[PDB]
Design an enzyme around this catalytic site. Structure first.
Site, PDB file in Angstrom:
ATOM      1  N   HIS A 130     -27.739 -38.330  13.600  1.00  0.00           N
ATOM      2  CA  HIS A 130     -28.397 -39.664  13.552  1.00  0.00           C
ATOM      3  C   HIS A 130     -29.162 -40.022  12.303  1.00  0.00           C
ATOM      4  O   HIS A 130     -29.902 -41.016  12.324  1.00  0.00           O
ATOM      5  CB  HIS A 130     -29.330 -39.797  14.745  1.00  0.00           C
ATOM      6  CG  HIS A 130     -28.633 -39.713  16.058  1.00  0.00           C
ATOM      7  ND1 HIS A 130     -27.723 -40.667  16.469  1.00  0.00           N
ATOM      8  CD2 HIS A 130     -28.684 -38.784  17.043  1.00  0.00           C
ATOM      9  CE1 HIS A 130     -27.243 -40.323  17.649  1.00  0.00           C
ATOM     10  NE2 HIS A 130     -27.834 -39.204  18.034  1.00  0.00           N
ATOM     11  N   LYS A 151     -16.237 -40.335  19.018  1.00  0.00           N
ATOM     12  CA  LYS A 151     -17.431 -40.774  19.732  1.00  0.00           C
ATOM     13  C   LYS A 151     -17.403 -42.287  19.915  1.00  0.00           C
ATOM     14  O   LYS A 151     -17.086 -43.041  19.014  1.00  0.00           O
ATOM     15  CB  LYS A 151     -18.701 -40.323  19.027  1.00  0.00           C
ATOM     16  CG  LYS A 151     -19.934 -40.325  19.915  1.00  0.00           C
ATOM     17  CD  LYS A 151     -21.153 -39.727  19.237  1.00  0.00           C
ATOM     18  CE  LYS A 151     -20.934 -38.348  18.660  1.00  0.00           C
ATOM     19  NZ  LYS A 151     -20.354 -37.344  19.582  1.00  0.00           N
ATOM     20  N   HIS A 158     -33.676 -36.528  20.276  1.00  0.00           N
ATOM     21  CA  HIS A 158     -32.702 -37.407  20.913  1.00  0.00           C
ATOM     22  C   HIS A 158     -32.988 -38.833  20.459  1.00  0.00           C
ATOM     23  O   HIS A 158     -34.134 -39.205  20.323  1.00  0.00           O
ATOM     24  CB  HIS A 158     -32.802 -37.279  22.442  1.00  0.00           C
ATOM     25  CG  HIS A 158     -32.149 -38.395  23.199  1.00  0.00           C
ATOM     26  ND1 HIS A 158     -30.824 -38.364  23.566  1.00  0.00           N
ATOM     27  CD2 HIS A 158     -32.640 -39.570  23.662  1.00  0.00           C
ATOM     28  CE1 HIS A 158     -30.519 -39.474  24.216  1.00  0.00           C
ATOM     29  NE2 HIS A 158     -31.604 -40.225  24.281  1.00  0.00           N
TER      30      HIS A 158
END
Length: 120
Positions: free
Chosen positions: A11, A38, A112
């Site tokens: 990310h 993805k 996350h």
């Protein structure tokens, strides 16, 4: 955190070129997210210092009890799979924006990214 380094690989992109559809197909390959493709993945830009700071008062507030939402906005790029096929070569469409981000933090490190906010 091994989790933090993993969050970074999935990310974080410090040096985005174009942030267009070409950028998404290339970065998604480079980060190993094409086997199978993805379906959606957002990258955060800028410096890591500001992303880490979301876990503390410096650049975050609590959110949904157990998450953190950033005080600052960040340059982001969301890569969304195009064309259906889950196998490479993967086709992506890019949506660039400049907005706050929501992460889960463990021990002062983001681990996350909440993807739900980038579907919109």
């Amino acid at each position: 955190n091994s989790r933090y380094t993993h969050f970074l690989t999935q990310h974080y992109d410090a040096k985005p070129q174009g942030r267009d559809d070409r950028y998404c197909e290339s970065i998604m390959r480079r980060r190993g997210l094409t086997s199978p493709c993805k379906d959606i993945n957002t990258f955060i830009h800028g410096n890591k210092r500001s992303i880490k700071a979301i876990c503390e008062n410096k650049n975050g507030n609590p959110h949904r009890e157990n998450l953190r939402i950033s005080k600052s906005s960040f340059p982001v790029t969301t890569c969304k799979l195009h064309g259906g096929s889950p196998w490479p070569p993967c086709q992506y469409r890019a949506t660039a924006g400049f907005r706050n981000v929501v992460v889960a933090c463990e021990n002062g490190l983001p681990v996350h990214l909440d993807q739900s906010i980038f579907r919109r």
